[PDB]
Design a protein around this ligand. Sequence first.
Ligand SMILES: Nc1ncnc2c1ncn2[C@@H]1O[C@H](COP(=O)(O)OP(=O)(O)O)[C@@H](O)[C@H]1O
Ligand SMILES: [Mg+2]
Length: 378
Amino acid sequence: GPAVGIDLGTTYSCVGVFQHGKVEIIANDQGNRTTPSYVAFTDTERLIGDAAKNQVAMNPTNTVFDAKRLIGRRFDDAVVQSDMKHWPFMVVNDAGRPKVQVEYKGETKSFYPEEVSSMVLTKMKEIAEAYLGKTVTNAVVTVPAYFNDSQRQATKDAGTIAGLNVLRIINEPTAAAIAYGLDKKVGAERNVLIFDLGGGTFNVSILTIEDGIFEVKSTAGDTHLGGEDFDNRMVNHFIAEFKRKHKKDISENKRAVRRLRTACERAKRTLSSSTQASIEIDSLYEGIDFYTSITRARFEELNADLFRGTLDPVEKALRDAKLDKSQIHDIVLVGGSTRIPKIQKLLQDFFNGKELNKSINPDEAVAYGAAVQAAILS
Ligand SMILES: Nc1ncnc2c1ncn2[C@@H]1O[C@H](COP(=O)(O)OP(=O)(O)O)[C@@H](O)[C@H]1O
Ligand SMILES: [Mg+2]
């Protein structure tokens, strides 16, 4: 079986495979090229991926996500302490290590973060196998550039327990560069800027590549900024609209909100190609059908400050790396949020018209690069 490339992401994961000089990003059962990093436990089963995320509104306490934020970390970790204040599931201490606690088939069960991730990993593995029509064993898994050795270890472990022989763990930005071929030797130093705006995390990385060797000269971003924050803004906006229109506040009804959010995220994706999208929700609150729409202009207006602030981490990355806009040779877009027009304009304007690398789907770039790296490693 060919070695595969796996992007084990915070909110979305992707698997690609190099074959006949071409990289193929493998779609899942539902036909999507990326699958949510969600795991849900019920009375009768364990749901992973889309099936899992498609019921989080119904089974909040038993639907686990954000496992990547826990992996390789300690319970006493300030990150963990701050984080768990927002997850609808339990995180318990176990001799220092944190564990997620769920109820599976009536009985209480706990899992180490690496076990949750191995579940997502097994899902990607069978997606690959379903496509290849053969067993996948070897793999290259990606990790953020800021991951310490514990976090890398845990990611490796998640692989082993998922039945995957992890050939190598490579940084996500480096995987993005390899996807565009920016790793080929041109007898000169090259500075690449990776602008990664995903589902819930934002990362900016400046790589220096000479002789084919990478050198992460600097990094920046925000671990709590992503496409989900843009969704929230739409939600708050629509909650206020429903109120004016029906003098009812649906805030308390978690289900109404969760369904509205799902409609928003979808409208958001449509907004990246169309100037407006309709929000059609049957029986949102009580028996009131919420039928409305948003325009790209209003969308951009709701997230203006968020979008604009995206440039601060870019300026920081520059000054830390000791470079000026003029010195960065290539800029590659990574993450599903970079498909947003305003974000592309804004970044280009900042780099005074410089062309942006974006021919490869941004949310598939890391997988793409890992698959290539897997191919050379085997
Ligand atoms: N067309 C699009 N326009 C805007 N956002 C998009 C689009 N397609 C996907 N996204 C967003 O990308 C995010 C997922 O990004 P992705 O990079 O796949 O995840 P991760 O951050 O987990 O690595 C979600 O917030 C999703 O709404
Ligand atoms: Mg990502």
